[PDB]
Design a protein around this ligand. Sequence first.
Ligand SMILES: CCCSc1c(F)c(F)c(S(N)(=O)=O)c(F)c1F
Ligand SMILES: CCCSc1c(F)c(F)c(S(N)(=O)=O)c(F)c1F
Ligand SMILES: [Zn+2]
Length: 257
Amino acid sequence: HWGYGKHNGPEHWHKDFPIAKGERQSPVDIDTHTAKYDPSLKPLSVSYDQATSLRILNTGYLFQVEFDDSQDKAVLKGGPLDGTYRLKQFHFHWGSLDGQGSEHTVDKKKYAAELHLVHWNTKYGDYGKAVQQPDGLAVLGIFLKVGSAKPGLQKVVDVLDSIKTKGKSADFTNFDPRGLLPESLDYWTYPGSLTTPPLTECVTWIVLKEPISVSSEQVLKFRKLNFNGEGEPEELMVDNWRPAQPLKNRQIKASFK
Ligand SMILES: CCCSc1c(F)c(F)c(S(N)(=O)=O)c(F)c1F
Ligand SMILES: CCCSc1c(F)c(F)c(S(N)(=O)=O)c(F)c1F
Ligand SMILES: [Zn+2]
């Protein structure tokens, strides 16, 4: 199966998922000097006041926190989006070293990790339909740098030892994703794709300019997870990021400056 290694990593994915070589692949390098300020973009509206987390899961590729998306609770709207997108899950990608781990880059700068909050377009009724459509998903991306601890991340960090291996889950209720946001909602936006197979071109990317700070100890705990399942040989879950893909004809828009 696909993964992040020499044998089955990003450079191999095209053989099972030919859209890997498509015209709107993600992530990309964000060249801050060619991005266009767009005074017509709206401020993002991130409404997470009624978010209901359910569960945290080690998928064998990453870990994800899942939300009850059976009602209009936690929604993203505004900015470049038409309509209303419902929060389904967040997850992270991270490095073996603090020097790498993010999927998007900024003027070629790699961050230690990248948080993705995945939302689906409620015009399509549910996630499984939405992920098939060109404007099905909106993913909010937030860079992590290593520095001061992020207090709102600690509840996540502390549960990871209960989901060390592929397929493990744990109840994860009452987690507030507002704790993971930076102060500023200034963003870049561009049309792209899932960054993991099946690499579908269904994503409007919204990448915040301001990183959040996490401690060395918090990211260290991400790196103790395992790609493998229980009772299989230990492979640390590190470097689960796809490198930047060709921008092709696309324009990155900035909400600011
Ligand atoms: C023997 C186990 C690895 S075989 C393999 C593979 F090499 C891939 F590149 C892929 S891919 N194109 O999905 O990365 C794959 F699914 C595989 F099963
Ligand atoms: C694979 C599709 C099922 S889960 C998923 C996803 F929805 C994403 F948007 C992304 S991402 N990285 O494009 O936000 C992701 F990595 C995922 F694993
Ligand atoms: Zn992701």
